[PDB]
Each structure stands twice: as C-alpha cells, then as structure tokens.
Amino acid sequence: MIQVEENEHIQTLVYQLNKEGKSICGDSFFMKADDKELICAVADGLGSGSLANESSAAIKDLVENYASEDVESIIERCNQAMKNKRGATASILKINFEQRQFTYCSVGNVRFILHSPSGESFYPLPISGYLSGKPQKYKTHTATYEKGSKFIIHTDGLNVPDIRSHLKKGQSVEEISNSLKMYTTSRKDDLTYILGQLS
C-alpha cells in the first residue's frame, strides 16, 4: 500500500505491506501534517498477526490522541498501553516546520535515518528492547534540519544494503520508494516505511 501526501513543508510517502499470507499488518503507522507541524509514528508489534497489530494499532491511536504532547510523553503512554499486550518497537517523530526543528524518540529496532544535502546525516543507534509495559529509559533527540533533508523511518522488515545512498541519490520520495521496491517483495515480515522530503 502506498500513500503520498504533501503540503508546503513536506512531501511524504508511506509504504506498508503485510507479512506473506497474513490478513492484518503487525506494523502500524500514524501520519499527520498541517501547516505548522508534522507528527508521525511507526510501530512494529512483536511477532505478527492480529495480536501484533493489537499492540501496534494501540500505539497508533495514542499517537493520534496525544499528538499535542511531546515525544517522550507520548512514548511513555504507549509503554503503559503495552501492559498485557505483546508489546512493540516504535519510533515517533515531531517536526516543527516554523523552527525547522524535530524531536525524535524511539524504543527498539525501528530505524530513523535523516540525510541532509550538506552531506551530514543523522542516524541514531536504536535503543535495545521493546515497549513491554516495564519501566523504560527514553531518549529524545532534538535537532535542526536543513531545507531539502530526506529521511526514512522503517520497521525491521525492510532490509536494504545501503539505505543512505538511496536517500542521497533519490530526488523525491517517489524516486527513493522505487529504488527500494526490490527489497519489499519477500514478505518474510510485515514491512512499513515512511519517507519524507522536507522543504
């Protein structure tokens, strides 16, 4: 499933496919942007199937409802919601268009790679473990981005040899998505990615 949306400040593309012969995606995503800010989140429920989706959809819903709060605060509420659920890995990203600034909070193997046309990249190593409901250290990265920045957030279903070069050489989220298409066909796992090109 490919979903594209743009406004003045960001062109986005979301790609989501279910694990082979599964009827429900274990991964979730949330995406909302208006003229001031963007919020998005990608979550991978443990395992797959409906109870993976139960955990990842609950994260999706919390991000939506608490979108006004800061990232750490939202991720906390997600951890709480994972009590007696399978749990999930997830990343949450807020962008303030007016300040060209982002805050990022993640737990587990969901990956965020930002590429700036000035060659600089932001590529935070993922926090170990998952959102299980147990007490969890959270870390927020806050940073300025450059006009023309290209980023991806993706679950571990997307395994690409050199994901940064794709972000570099592609000139639109469409181009980048197409260069990655060949890594999306195995269906060994649910596969979700968000691509953004920032004005």
- Residue number with the smallest Cβ distance to Mn ion: 26
| Smallest distance, Mn ion to C-beta of residue 52, A | 5
Nearer Cβ to Mn ion, position 111 or 166?
Answer: 111
Closest listed residue to residue 114, CA positions, set 151, 145, 84: 151
Nearer Cβ to Mn ion, position 6 or 156?
Answer: 156
Nearer Cβ to Mn ion, position 25 or 93?
Answer: 25
With the CA atoms of 171, 173, 47 and 60 taken in that order, what torsion angle do they form, in degrees rounded to the nearest 10? 140
Residues 6+ apart with CB under 8 A from 7: 33, 34, 35
Closest listed residue to residue 109, CA positions, set 38, 33, 192: 192
| Smallest distance, Mn ion to C-beta of residue 40, A | 18
| Smallest distance, Mn ion to C-beta of residue 67, A | 23
Nearer Cβ to Mn ion, position 22 or 100?
Answer: 22
Three-class SS state of 113: strand
| Smallest distance, Mn ion to C-beta of residue 194, A | 15
Q: At what angle do helices 50-65 and 71-81 cross, to 10 degrees?
A: 140
Q: Which residues bind Mn ion (CB under 5 A)?
A: 26, 44, 52, 155-157, 189
